[PDB]
Amino acid sequence: QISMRLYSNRDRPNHLGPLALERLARVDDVVAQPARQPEDGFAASEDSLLGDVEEYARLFTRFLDGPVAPLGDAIPDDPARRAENLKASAYFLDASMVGICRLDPDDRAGDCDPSHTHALVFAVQFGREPEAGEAGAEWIRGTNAARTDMRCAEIAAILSGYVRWMGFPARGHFSGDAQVDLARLAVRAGLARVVDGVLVAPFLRRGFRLGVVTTGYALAADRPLAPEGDLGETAPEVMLGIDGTRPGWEDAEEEKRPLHMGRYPMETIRRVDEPTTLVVRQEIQRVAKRGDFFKRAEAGDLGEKAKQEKKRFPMKHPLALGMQPLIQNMVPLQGTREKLAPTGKGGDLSDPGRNAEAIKALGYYLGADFVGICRAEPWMYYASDEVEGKPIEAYHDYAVVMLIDQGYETMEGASGDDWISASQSMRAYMRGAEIAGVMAAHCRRMGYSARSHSNAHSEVIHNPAILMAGLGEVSRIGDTLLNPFIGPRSKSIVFTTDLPMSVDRPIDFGLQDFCNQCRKCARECPCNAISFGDKVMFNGYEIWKADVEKCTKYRVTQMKGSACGRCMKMCPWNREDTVEGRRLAELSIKVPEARAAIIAMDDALQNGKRNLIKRWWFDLEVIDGVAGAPRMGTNERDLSPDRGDKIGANQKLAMYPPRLQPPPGTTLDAVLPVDRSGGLAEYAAAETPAAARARLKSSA
Ligand code: B12
Ligand SMILES: O=C(O)c1ccc(O)c(Br)c1
Ligand code: SF4
Ligand code: SF4
Ligand code: NA
């Protein structure tokens, strides 16, 4: 695979994006002319996704405008900084291309707010579609504009809400609900030119759709593209992406892989029938959802401060607040548990192997980074819900598991526990829930029960589904599985369904031996919650059990950031998507003799250091509905020194298997103070995986 960037973007600020837009011919003004956005080249049937992406577009539309917070005294004045931060925000949310332009009278003369002076214009590129005759082509053909419009409305809604929380009135616009001329503003903002009355954007050869945020929050404006002639898209500096931008050949190369195979070469990873760590199904107890340690925090199980902060701790930052409406209001759409009657829509559904390819292709078309399929085994479902305490049924046969990359470049400039951490969680959560909600809907359209499991509402535990779907291995981080290509830098989304699909197999890329020689995540955890010792048996399976009490307490309670994810950032597998980055992963997998060296040089080269160029976000904590400067400061952590050579023997963590959890049926209205002394003793008594294998063998 030769599409990886040759050159690093480590010195490229995020407001510049992944495309070398700063190398295109531009001029101060251009004469406006009629233009429409690109459209599909075919129509969509009743077999098609179309109805579902339109529903979610309509849902996001109700968050294009909303309440405006009081103006604090911490919002930077400089329009240039405002421009970069908002541009970077849009790229964070996966805009393909971003620009800014000034609104003039003719725009404010419509239903648009008359106090609006500037427009943030962004484009999202059409998704890749299955080739004719491929599995799922009928589900997708003709849905690209609506599909891309949904994504635009999403981003517009988040960004508009983001500015509104900084105290500035703002309004999102897209084809489905726009008060301004979208095409006209895209040309003025320098994203596109006009060919035969249709917009044409450089680099976005697949087509695109637009979104816009109009606001009185003043921004530095960009300049339109040179109206005629070659823009320089194929100049040598741009073709090779010398500044760390998308190579000029990557599109043509990527488009040679079948869409259902995803972008990362998972087909090259070794497969095994059973996971690389022991799983003893007959010994795995199901856990009350009330045993979720956030649910425990919420009920008072972890003290009053954890209970107080449980609601706000991930919403301290205005960007995450812009995502909350979408997150919470997608929940009522997650799907059904009852059996459905196959409706005859969706084409030929008799080949489970073709069904899996269509589902994977469908996920990648919608924005997933990884798709895997496994059976939703009953021990993967929670025993009981946390609100009413009623039993949860194992109501679906299959689990579709998708990984959303949390974002390398943002995490590179962060501490892992500063004011953007929860925003990296919530973005991946918001994006996965959207994609999974759309896919479950389509399954239900075809007459196959399906329900998604999101951050706001899940009835399965994602982890074992990530394992069985072959998307990660057990890693030292504990409650996080590690993928060979994006390491631990992910949020998973799962949706269960009865749609017959061929399942994937667990993967084996050598991580057990690698984590056995590595301690970086454990060394860098601010509250020492990650284990330095051997794997233990836990509720019937082998795992590195982190101390989930200490982690929960720190994420909900620490006041120099919003939550934490520092362990993802520090892991050596958290790497840039470069030629040398992939090769370091390749070597880690194929050359065991080189692992110790890679683990050491990761420190010697100061990997994990904060890259100040990538720190694009504002430090804003919302207190009493008003964004202000962080009341207590901001985490700015740097590489830490070794703990003892004896820390694996001395560190003592608490574990909470079902025995030390709220029993099935317990609700949030009961309180069960965390029995830490019992969790410490429990951990000391945990069977070692070696003893479990001996014990199982004696009944084989
Ligand atoms: C609440 C919660 C936490 C809590 C508490 C978890 C807990 N154990 O109580 C803390 C602990 C606060 C937490 C921490 C983080 N977690 Co969290 N956690 C959750 C959440 C929402 C609940 C887990 C749960 O069901 N209850 C707790 C009970 C079931 O815990 P348990 O009995 O000890 O079992 C745990 C593990 O043993 C594992 N597991 C259970 N059965 C089996 C069986 C096998 C064979 C294996 C291998 C594993 C496994 O799953 C449980 C995860 O907590 C899930 C989301 C979800 N719906 O699953 C994620 C989730 C697992 N965590 C996730 C992440 C990303 C994080 C963080 C990195 C935060 C961040 N910035 O992203 C940190 C890392 C923590 C670490 N050191 O590993 C991701 C992991 C994805 C992945 N790639 O593996 C999840 C899946 C959310 C998601 N949608 O992606 N979060
Ligand atoms: O319930 C919450 O507040 C919550 C749930 C999931 C999650 O990843 C985070 Br961060 C917070
Ligand atoms: S284990 Fe928890 S507290 Fe420690 S670095 Fe990871 S997210 Fe932060
Ligand atoms: S930091 Fe090292 S030990 Fe921790 S998960 Fe990553 S590779 Fe494994
Ligand atoms: Na790293």
Residue numbers in the entry: -2 to 697
Quote the original article.
The reductive dehalogenases (RDases) are key enzymes in organohalide respiration, which is performed by a unique subset of bacteria. The RDases are cobalamin-dependent and able to selectively cleave carbon-halogen bonds through reduction. The RDases can be split into two classes: (i) the canonical respiratory dehalogenases, which use a halogenated compound as a final electron acceptor during organohalide respiration and (ii) the catabolic respiratory dehalogenases that occur in the catabolic pathways of non-organohalide respiring bacteria. Structural insight into RDase function is based on two enzymes that have been crystallised, the respiratory perchloroethene (PCE) Sulfurospirillum multivorans reductive dehalogenase (PceA), and the catabolic reductive dehalogenase from Nitratireductor pacificus pht-3B (NpRdhA).
Only one conformation provides a halogen beta axial ligand and thus resembles the 35-DB-4-OH substrate complex (occupancy 30%). One of the two distinct, non-Co-ligating conformations corresponds to that of the previously observed 35-DB-4-OH in crystallo reduction product (occupancy 30%), while the other occupies the entrance of the active site cavity (occupancy 40%). In the latter case, the 3-B-4-OH benzoic acid group forms a salt bridge with K307 (3.1 Å) while the phenolic oxygen interacts with Y426 (2.5 Å). The 3-B-4-OH reductase activity of NpRdhA has previously been shown to be significantly lower (~20%) compared with the 35-DB-4-OH reductase activity. The 3-B-4-OH bound structure reveals this is likely due to multiple conformations, only one of which appears catalytically competent. Indeed, inhibition of NpRdhA reductase activity due to inhibitory substrate binding modes likely accounts for the higher Km and lower kcat seen for this substrate in comparison to 35-DB-4-OH. The lower propensity of 3-B-4-OH to bind in a productive orientation might in part explain the lower activity seen with this substrate in comparison to 35-DB-4-OH.
